[PDB]
Amino acid sequence: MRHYEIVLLVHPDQSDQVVGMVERYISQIKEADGQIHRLEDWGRRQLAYPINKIHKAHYILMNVECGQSTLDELEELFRYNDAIIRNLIIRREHAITEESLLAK
Amino acid sequence: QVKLKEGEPVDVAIRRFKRSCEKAGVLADVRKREFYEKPTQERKRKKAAAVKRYQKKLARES
Amino acid sequence: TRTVSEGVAHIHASFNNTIVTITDRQGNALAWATSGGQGFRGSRKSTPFAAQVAAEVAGKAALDYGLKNLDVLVKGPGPGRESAVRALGAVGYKINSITDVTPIPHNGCRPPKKRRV
Amino acid sequence: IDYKDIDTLKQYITENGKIVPSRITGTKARYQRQLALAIKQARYLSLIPYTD
Amino acid sequence: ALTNADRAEIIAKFARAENDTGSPEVQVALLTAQINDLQGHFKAHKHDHHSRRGLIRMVNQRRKLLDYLNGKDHERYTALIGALGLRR
RNA sequence: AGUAUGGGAGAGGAUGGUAGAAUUCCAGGUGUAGCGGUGAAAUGCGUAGAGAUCUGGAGGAAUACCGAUGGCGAAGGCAGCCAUCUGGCCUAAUACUGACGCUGAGGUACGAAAGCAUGGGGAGCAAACAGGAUUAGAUACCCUGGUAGUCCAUGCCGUAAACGAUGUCUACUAGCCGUUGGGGCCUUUGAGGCUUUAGUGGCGCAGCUAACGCGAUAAGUAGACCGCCUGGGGAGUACGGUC
Numbered sequence: 001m002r003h004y005e006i007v008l009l010v011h012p013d014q015s016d017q018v019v020g021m022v023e024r025y026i027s028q029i030k031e032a033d034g035q036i037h038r039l040e041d042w043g044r045r046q047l048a049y050p051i052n053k054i055h056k057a058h059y060i061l062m063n064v065e066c067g068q069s070t071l072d073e074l075e076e077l078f079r080y081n082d083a084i085i086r087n088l089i090i091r092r093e094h095a096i097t098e099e100s101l102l103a104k
Numbered sequence: 105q106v107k108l109k110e111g112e113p114v115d116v117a118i119r120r121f122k123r124s125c126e127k128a129g130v131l132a133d134v135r136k137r138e139f140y141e142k143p144t145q146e147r148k149r150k151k152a153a154a155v156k157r158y159q160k161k162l163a164r165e166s
Numbered sequence: 167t168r169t170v171s172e173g174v175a176h177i178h179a180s181f182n183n184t185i186v187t188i189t190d191r192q193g194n195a196l197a198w199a200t201s202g203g204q205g206f207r208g209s210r211k212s213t214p215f216a217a218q219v220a221a222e223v224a225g226k227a228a229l230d231y232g233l234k235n236l237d238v239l240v241k242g243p244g245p246g247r248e249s250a251v252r253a254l255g256a257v258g259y260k261i262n263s264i265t266d267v268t269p270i271p272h273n274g275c276r277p278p279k280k281r282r283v
Numbered sequence: 284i285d286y287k288d289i290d291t292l293k294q295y296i297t298e299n300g301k302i303v304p305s306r307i308t309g310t311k312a313r314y315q316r317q318l319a320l321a322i323k324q325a326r327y328l329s330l331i332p333y334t335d
Numbered sequence: 336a337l338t339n340a341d342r343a344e345i346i347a348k349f350a351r352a353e354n355d356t357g358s359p360e361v362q363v364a365l366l367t368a369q370i371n372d373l374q375g376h377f378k379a380h381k382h383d384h385h386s387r388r389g390l391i392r393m394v395n396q397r398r399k400l401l402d403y404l405n406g407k408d409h410e411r412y413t414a415l416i417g418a419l420g421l422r423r
Numbered sequence: 424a425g426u427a428u429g430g431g432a433g434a435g436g437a438u439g440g441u442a443g444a445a446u447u448c449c450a451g452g453u454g455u456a457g458c459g460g461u462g463a464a465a466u467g468c469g470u471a472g473a474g475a476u477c478u479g480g481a482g483g484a485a486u487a488c489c490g491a492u493g494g495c496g497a498a499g500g501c502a503g504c505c506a507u508c509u510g511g512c513c514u515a516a517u518a519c520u521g522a523c524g525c526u527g528a529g530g531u532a533c534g535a536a537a538g539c540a541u542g543g544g545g546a547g548c549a550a551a552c553a554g555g556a557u558u559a560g561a562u563a564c565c566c567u568g569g570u571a572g573u574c575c576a577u578g579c580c581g582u583a584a585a586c587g588a589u590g591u592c593u594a595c596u597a598g599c600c601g602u603u604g605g606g607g608c609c610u611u612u613g614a615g616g617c618u619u620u621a622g623u624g625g626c627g628c629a630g631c632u633a634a635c636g637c638g639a640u641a642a643g644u645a646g647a648c649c650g651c652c653u654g655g656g657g658a659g660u661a662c663g664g665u666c
């Protein structure tokens with residue numbers, strides 16, 4: 001399969017549903033197949049510029065291995081979830097498991 | 105975005121500010137935005153600039 | 167009637183004119199002056215002296231509202247920005263800061279054609 | 284270099300937010316390309332401002 | 336796109352000897368597999384002229400190799416075209 | 424000449440999403456006589472409230488900085504970021520086929536911009552056109568407006584100073600200094616110094632040229648194949664034909 005790295009920005013008002021959404025996505029990836037090499041919750045951070053009249057957001061980092069169907073459903077779920085204001089998905093070669101900066 | 109000091113004089117503030125602006129070089133973009141430059145003209149200008157740069161480098165090495 | 171201690175000066179200085187407007191924060195205008203409003207018609211409207219005379223007029227007009235310190239924003243490649251910022255200090259305000267806010271497109275709309283003078 | 288290393292990303296950014304040229308920073312061309320990609324990704328992630 | 340396993344399967348099926356990769360049979364089989372795989376891509380993207388150039392190059396290379404094989408050994412040529420279903 | 428396996432760089436192509444800056448328009452708050460434009464003016468906009476300033480919304484087009492005598496592509500050409508599909512190139516060592524090559528009349532594919540057909544879209548710009556200036560006259564250059572078009576989908580057209588004004592392929596012939604993507608070696612700790620390869624630049628010995636100039640990216644020394652020229656106009660024109 002292909003390794004992907006996903007960064008999600010969650011609305012600070014929905015900060016206490018992030019665990020539920022993360023577990024749901026992890027369960028979907030696992031039932032497809034999936035190897036969640038890394039998952040980090042950077043926390044609630046201030047934004048460099050306001051997004052959607054908001055100044056803070058919850059930052060979530062995931063590194064997954066999945067197939068085309070898992071990717072398509074994951075992206076569609078990200079699009080339709082209103083708590084997620086901005087998501088970045090980048091493909092990577094190699095699985096990255098070490099702790100990253102901003103994990104503090 | 106120049107912030108004056110406590111006892112900072114007005115003329116010194118104006119001066120420090122507009123070569124802060126000269127360092128920023130916004131006025132160059134403003135001048136560029138007055139008229140449309142065709143791609144052929146832009147490429148000719150950039151080629152001339154590259155030639156001048158290379159001739160300057162040789163002189164400064166010598 | 168309304169009193170306010172802190173305000174912002176906006177100097178819109180083009181190559182044909184220079185408008186100085188004194189507002190309070192959140193962008194509510196209090197007094198404004200232009201080179202056209204002090205005579206200086208036509209080509210003479212762009213000289214730095216006209217920018218100066220518009221600037222003191224605006225400063226004195228705002229003195230009625232009674233602001234002692236202000237922050238300055240200059241936009242445009244005008245010849246009168248020097249005079250406009252200088253005249254406020256002569257009027258007697260305290261300049262907290264001064265910044266340039268000329269908008270820069272990130273390769274947006276096509277500008278008009280070149281003049282073949 | 285990746286987009287998460289905000290401290291190094293700021294070392295090549297002016298106070299306005301513009302990317303600093305390689306002719307000024309003395310960097311290699313490939314490193315400069317990677318740096319520009321990382322900066323553009325970090326701006327999208329709202330980690331660093333686009334301007335100012 | 337074909338993968339290493341598919342290419343190895345084709346090579347093993349059409350090899351004339353051990354560690355044989357350069358024989359005209361192997362080369363023509365690989366080119367035929369690649370062309371048949373790219374047909375589907377060019378159905379979806381009608382205006383990918385830049386990739387169609389590489390497809391045309393593959394077709395030309397296969398034709399040249401088939402002509403060379405026919406010149407050298409007729410029986411091998413007929414066997415290969417029959418195996419891959421090529422009309423000529 | 425080609426094939427399999429590892430590694431690498433790239434604005435190469437196609438599809439779909441998405442981000443920020445700016446212009447225009449709309450609505451609202453603050454606010455009041457100008458704004459705009461030029462060599463100078465005028466046409467134009469504004470007291471049913473402009474311009475300026477702040478907040479929100481709509482839409483289209485293009486991607487600042489990085490950016491480079493940089494990169495990729497047969498050429499035409501290709502720049503925000505992300506995913507999917509996909510072509511070529513570079514680089515190391517073995518392994519494999521065994522001349523399978525070069526060029527190419529006809530033929531065929533691609534081919535900037537403008538233009539054409541059907542249907543959408545339309546912010547900014549702007550042929551045609553309207554008005555204001557200038558002028559002996561203005562038919563133009565300047566100014567205020569402004570429709571095709573520029574954008575998208577599906578096709579056509581097949582032309583450019585489509586240029587390096589330099590057809591493709593191969594071998595050989597002093598050196599010096601840059602730069603991009605790789606390979607190797609050496610210091611000795613991490614950044615430098617030698618080479619080699621494929622591109623991209625500046626000088627320059629020999630040689631060549633009417634001269635200007637070219638000079639391992641030849642316009643030098645040789646070979647293979649193709650295209651083209653034969654004084655200037657008439658003329659890339661008429662007739663015939665193909666599209």
Ligand SMILES: NCCC[C@H](N)CC(=O)NCCC[C@H](N)CC(=O)NCCC[C@H](N)CC(=O)N[C@@H]1[C@H](O)[C@@H](OC(N)=O)[C@@H](CO)O[C@H]1NC1=N[C@@H]2C(=O)NC[C@@H](O)[C@H]2N1
Binds near residue numbers: 587640
């Ligand atoms: N497998 C090989 C792969 C090859 C690769 N693909 C490309 C390649 O390698 N080609 C070989 C180089 C041939 C070159 N094109 C011929 C040439 O250079 N001039 C043409 C002869 C004109 C005349 N006899 C000399 C002349 O007037 N010189 C001027 C002059 O020096 C100077 O101007 C002025 N006013 O003083 C300079 C700066 O403006 O410009 C030059 N003029 C120019 N400089 C440009 C340039 O080099 N190119 C493009 C074009 O723009 C050129 N004109």
